[PDB]
A paper describes a structure:
In the next optimization round, we modified the linker region to eliminate the chemically liable azo moiety. Substituting the phenyldiazene moiety with a quinoline (NB437) or simply deleting the diazo moiety ([name], 31a) was much better tolerated, though, resulting in two more or less equipotent [name] binders, with ΔTm values between 4 and 5 K for BD1 and BD2, respectively. Isothermal titration calorimetry (ITC) measurements showed that [name] binds to BD1 with a Kd value of 145 nM. High-resolution (1.2 Å) crystal structures of BD1 complexed with NB437 and [name] revealed that the binding mode of the Asn140-targeting moiety was virtually unperturbed by the linker modification and that the loss in potency compared with the parent molecule for the shorter compound [name] can be attributed to suboptimal hydrophobic packing against the WPF-shelf region. When testing HDAC1/2 binding potency in cells by the NanoBRET assay, [name] was about an order of magnitude more potent than NB437 (EC50 of 2.6 vs 23 μM for HDAC1 and 1.6 vs 25 μM for HDAC2). We therefore decided to explore further SAR on the shorter, more soluble variant [name], testing the effect of additional substituents or heteroatoms in the aromatic ring of the linker. A DSF selectivity screen of [name] against a panel of 32 bromodomains covering all main branches of the bromodomain tree confirmed high stabilization of [name] bromodomains but also revealed BRD7 and BRD9 as prominent off-targets. This gain in selectivity suggests that the aniline moiety of [name] facilitates stabilizing interactions with BRD7/9 that are perturbed upon the addition of an aromatic substituent at the 5-position in NB503.
Bromodomain and extra-terminal domain ([name]) proteins and histone deacetylases (HDACs) are prime targets in cancer therapy. Here, we developed a new series of potent dual [name]/[name] inhibitors by choosing starting scaffolds that enabled us to optimally merge the two functionalities into a single compound. We merged [name] and class I [name] pharmacophores, resulting in dual inhibitors of reduced molecular weight with a core scaffold of only 350 Da harboring both inhibitor activities.
Residue numbers in the entry: 42 to 165
Amino acid sequence: SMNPPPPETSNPNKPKRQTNQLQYLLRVVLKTLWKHQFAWPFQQPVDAVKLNLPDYYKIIKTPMDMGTIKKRLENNYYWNAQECIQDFNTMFTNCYIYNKPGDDIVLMAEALEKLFLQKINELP
Ligand SMILES: Cn1cc(-c2ccc(C(=O)Nc3ccccc3N)cc2)c2cc[nH]c2c1=O
């Protein structure tokens, strides 16, 4: 199909370890973006088939979405907060490199990214 297998969300060979920053990323950062009115296009992998975007996964080499990030946090996939922040950054980058500037989806991403950066500015 137009769609790749979704990203893995569990790392079983990794030890399970909480950190203050990972708790913050799940319980403050992800939670705040997840509940936002503009979160909905970002809560699951882009379904290029249903959306008829045949070039999406030609342009986007590293798919990422908030649902994947949420599950990765819930399964303690990330070794540290920077790995999680990188996935958020990738999700926004994908939106900005695929969609035309000023598209509704880009304006949605920009609003979510601003909130993300504001919360990251207070990472413990
Ligand atoms: C990240 N991202 C997401 C999306 C994206 C857009 C729409 C949906 C979606 O579920 N639409 C919908 C609304 C109401 C009823 C049924 C459906 N299917 C999901 C995703 C997208 C589209 C162009 N470009 C991007 C884009 O970059």
